[PDB]
Write an enzyme that holds these catalytic residues in place. Structure first.
Site, PDB file in Angstrom:
ATOM      1  N   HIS A 132       0.637  -1.428  -0.124  1.00  0.00           N
ATOM      2  CA  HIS A 132       0.019   0.098   0.016  1.00  0.00           C
ATOM      3  C   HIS A 132       0.949   1.289   0.002  1.00  0.00           C
ATOM      4  O   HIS A 132       0.286   2.328  -0.027  1.00  0.00           O
ATOM      5  CB  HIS A 132      -0.918   0.072   1.058  1.00  0.00           C
ATOM      6  CG  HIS A 132      -0.188   0.159   2.380  1.00  0.00           C
ATOM      7  ND1 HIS A 132      -0.149  -0.949   3.283  1.00  0.00           N
ATOM      8  CD2 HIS A 132       0.027   1.542   3.048  1.00  0.00           C
ATOM      9  CE1 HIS A 132       0.418  -0.354   4.475  1.00  0.00           C
ATOM     10  NE2 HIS A 132       0.491   0.782   4.502  1.00  0.00           N
ATOM     11  N   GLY A 142       3.261   5.912   9.630  1.00  0.00           N
ATOM     12  CA  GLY A 142       4.542   5.891   9.286  1.00  0.00           C
ATOM     13  C   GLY A 142       5.114   4.617   9.645  1.00  0.00           C
ATOM     14  O   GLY A 142       6.379   4.177   9.327  1.00  0.00           O
ATOM     15  N   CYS A 170       4.254   1.392   9.306  1.00  0.00           N
ATOM     16  CA  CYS A 170       4.143   0.080   8.430  1.00  0.00           C
ATOM     17  C   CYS A 170       5.434  -0.164   7.789  1.00  0.00           C
ATOM     18  O   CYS A 170       6.277   0.590   7.251  1.00  0.00           O
ATOM     19  CB  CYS A 170       3.153   0.575   7.008  1.00  0.00           C
ATOM     20  SG  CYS A 170       1.602   0.507   7.870  1.00  0.00           S
TER      21      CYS A 170
HETATM   22  C1  LIG Z   1       1.285   2.202   7.839  1.00  0.00           C
HETATM   23  O1  LIG Z   1       1.010   2.644   6.688  1.00  0.00           O
HETATM   24  C2  LIG Z   1      -0.017   2.439   8.607  1.00  0.00           C
HETATM   25  C3  LIG Z   1       0.034   2.180  10.099  1.00  0.00           C
HETATM   26  C4  LIG Z   1      -1.568   2.458  10.982  1.00  0.00           C
HETATM   27  C5  LIG Z   1      -1.913   3.783  10.937  1.00  0.00           C
HETATM   28  C6  LIG Z   1      -2.437   3.964  12.419  1.00  0.00           C
HETATM   29  N1  LIG Z   1      -1.915   2.905  13.094  1.00  0.00           N
HETATM   30  C7  LIG Z   1      -1.477   1.825  12.287  1.00  0.00           C
HETATM   31  O2  LIG Z   1      -0.857   0.906  12.788  1.00  0.00           O
HETATM   32  N2  LIG Z   1      -1.269   1.848   8.060  1.00  0.00           N
HETATM   33  C8  LIG Z   1      -2.195   2.090   7.688  1.00  0.00           C
HETATM   34  O3  LIG Z   1      -2.840   3.364   7.687  1.00  0.00           O
HETATM   35  C9  LIG Z   1      -3.611   1.343   6.993  1.00  0.00           C
HETATM   36  C10 LIG Z   1      -3.149   1.112   5.438  1.00  0.00           C
HETATM   37  C11 LIG Z   1      -4.210   0.446   4.389  1.00  0.00           C
HETATM   38  C12 LIG Z   1      -3.964   0.424   3.174  1.00  0.00           C
HETATM   39  C13 LIG Z   1      -4.559  -0.933   5.148  1.00  0.00           C
HETATM   40  N3  LIG Z   1      -4.717   1.968   7.534  1.00  0.00           N
HETATM   41  C14 LIG Z   1      -5.469   1.734   8.385  1.00  0.00           C
HETATM   42  O4  LIG Z   1      -4.898   1.211   9.363  1.00  0.00           O
HETATM   43  O5  LIG Z   1      -6.329   2.787   8.838  1.00  0.00           O
HETATM   44  C15 LIG Z   1      -7.008   2.935   9.816  1.00  0.00           C
HETATM   45  C16 LIG Z   1      -6.049   3.366  11.055  1.00  0.00           C
HETATM   46  C17 LIG Z   1      -7.965   4.007   9.713  1.00  0.00           C
HETATM   47  C18 LIG Z   1      -7.738   1.722  10.358  1.00  0.00           C
HETATM   48  C19 LIG Z   1      -8.367   0.794   9.095  1.00  0.00           C
HETATM   49  C20 LIG Z   1      -8.942  -0.247   9.481  1.00  0.00           C
HETATM   50  C21 LIG Z   1     -10.187  -0.523  10.531  1.00  0.00           C
HETATM   51  F1  LIG Z   1     -11.169   0.140   9.963  1.00  0.00           F
HETATM   52  F2  LIG Z   1     -10.607  -1.724  10.586  1.00  0.00           F
HETATM   53  C22 LIG Z   1      -9.564   0.213  11.558  1.00  0.00           C
HETATM   54  C23 LIG Z   1      -8.866   1.645  11.393  1.00  0.00           C
END
Ligand SMILES: *[C@@H](O)[C@H](C[C@@H]1CC=NC1=O)NC(=O)[C@H](CC(C)C)NC(=O)OC(C)(C)C1CCC(F)(F)CC1
Ligand SMILES: *[C@@H](O)[C@H](C[C@@H]1CC=NC1=O)NC(=O)[C@H](CC(C)C)NC(=O)OC(C)(C)C1CCC(F)(F)CC1
Lengths: 297, 295
Positions: free
Chosen positions: A39, A141, A143
């Site tokens: 992603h 950040g 990930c």
């Molecule tokens: C690294 O890119 C981030 C790390 C996340 C950000 C906040 N805490 C973490 O551990 N990954 C993401 O932002 C992912 C990326 C997607 C392509 C999967 N998105 C994400 O985790 O979004 C949130 C924080 C809004 C969550 C989405 C899934 C959920 F609806 F089940 C809970 C919220």
């Protein structure tokens, strides 16, 4: 006694920064390959329901900026494997440790090197929960941060971080990009199962407590079938004889029969800790394996 | 939110094995100096009441075997409770570093080592009574505690001994013990411990930041709260403490004195079986700085 991670130096030397457009995250640089969450090729809009094949088709090798410290690496190839991007680079990492990729089992533990912008910030010990989440400490950040164990000189990479879930727990993949658990890398609410307590780990921790002189909870005995009657009630993993035998080293070091330890556990589950504490905790800890406890004693 | 240690790579490259006679422990190799606990020169017998000056008189450079995965020892001095071994090779892996003496209530990472090899890393606090609640077995002495500031490793602790309650004691890297302890194998009183109040508040801010707000209630005064802290062996809260929490107060919109209000209630009523950030006790080993770094 203490939640202890592996020393992280061998992994620190593998962390790089990966940028594709405006999105930046961490990648893991091993030999001539950088591994990162796929992603990274997403814009903010994409994240809600991405067609990753279509998105990556629009990216070329030169759209991937890999920085290793103050040094940009040149990307010469790219493939998607499940939920990970593999970037082939022209330079093999001089700091590549001996390593393998492994897919861990629920109830096993591992160390996380939490990173931001390719730079390590901290290290801590996690468990793969029975529902295939981890209870981490991850910010935007983070990930591409990885989880690992160290077997002598050999780093076993087992986790790459991808997302947060609605209860604030975390989900990610193995280093082949297959998620642990039922999750998918799209920014939608997703059900993690009912979690359960890792019974064998709780026993390992009571042995750890005994080993350290904390013995108040010891008592009665019980049967394996009778304990599981009580474990099922409290959402504990059922205990097998394989578990009994995995606890053998601790059973032997202490002279306490597993089933006797079970009897006291039924007592603590049934009665609670009446305000007392065990190894400085006021709850039953289940993220130390028998292996972990041996290592630390 | 959880207990996070600094990455340990810069320190792993400094750990060596120091042997003198039969006794083996860890030393810290920086530039051309190896630092280790001076009781490496003790036999099992000596340790009950060693005359370290006399004991060292009898040792020469070649009685000290230093091994980084053998270094040649060309000089040796005792500084307080640490031995300094001058070696002929400077550590090529020496990081930018300083030696600092930390204050009680501050935290640091420990790289626990055995035979000069890292086994694990974890986060500790220097308690008000100058002990630490560590995880150390025989052979762990000379393991060090540290903080990382950008590129710079600040070494603050070297491990020497256990105390009767299972807590641990050691020195700064100049060999001066934290607290009243001495490196002899006799029972020694640690003071009454006290709870690091500012750290408990920081962690309540951490909890609020992470969505855990059930304990939020009332207000109080600094003198009123401290009347209740003193009762519960909490460090009294000062305005410097209030100001150190500023970034957290600012990030949450909760006045420190209001947080004090909720905290008094928890101290008075307990947590009624609830939890905060997954703990059933009030955690006091995260500094405001630490909580900031993790949020
Ligand atoms: C690294 O890119 C981030 C790390 C996340 C950000 C906040 N805490 C973490 O551990 N990954 C993401 O932002 C992912 C990326 C997607 C392509 C999967 N998105 C994400 O985790 O979004 C949130 C924080 C809004 C969550 C989405 C899934 C959920 F609806 F089940 C809970 C919220
Ligand atoms: C490193 O050499 C060890 C590490 C200790 C041993 C077990 N846990 C630890 O943290 N240090 C020692 O063995 C010291 C060495 C002396 C020269 C100070 N001795 C020591 O800690 O002895 C014991 C464990 C018996 C304690 C002695 C002081 C005490 F009486 F207060 C409690 C017991």
């Amino acid at each position: 006694f203490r939640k202890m991670a592996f020393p992280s130096g061998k992994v620190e030397g593998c962390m790089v920064q990966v940028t594709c457009g405006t999105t930046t995250l961490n990648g893991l640089w091993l030999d001539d390959v950088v591994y990162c969450p796929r992603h990274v090729i997403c814009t903010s809009e994409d994240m809600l329901n991405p067609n990753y094949e279509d998105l990556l088709i629009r990216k070329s090798n030169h759209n991937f900026l890999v920085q290793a410290g103050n040094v940009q690496l040149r990307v010469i190839g790219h493939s998607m494997q499940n939920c990970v991007l593999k970037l082939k680079v022209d330079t093999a990492n001089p700091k590549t440790p001996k390593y393998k990729f492994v897919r861990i089992q629920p109830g096993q533990t591992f160390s996380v090197l939490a990173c931001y912008n390719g730079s390590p910030s901290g290290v801590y010990q996690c468990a793969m929960r029975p529902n295939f989440t981890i209870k981490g400490s991850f910010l935007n950040g983070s990930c591409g941060s990885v989880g690992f164990n160290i077997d002598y000189d050999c780093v076993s990479f087992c986790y790459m971080h991808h997302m947060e879930l609605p209860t604030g727990v975390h989900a990610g993949t193995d280093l082949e990009g297959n998620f642990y658990g039922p999750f998918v890398d799209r920014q939608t609410a997703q059900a993690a199962g009912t979690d359960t307590t890792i019974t064998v780990n709780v026993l390992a921790w009571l042995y750890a407590a005994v080993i350290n002189g904390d013995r108040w909870f010891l008592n009665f005995t019980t049967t394996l079938n009778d304990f599981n009657l009580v474990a099922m009630k409290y959402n504990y993993e059922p205990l097998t004889q394989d578990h009994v035998d995995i606890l053998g080293p601790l059973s032997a070091q202490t002279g306490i029969a597993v089933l006797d330890m079970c009897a006291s556990l039924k007592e603590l589950l049934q009665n609670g800790m009446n305000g007392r504490t065990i190894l400085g905790s006021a709850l039953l800890e289940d993220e130390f394996t028998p292996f972990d406890v041996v290592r630390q004693c």
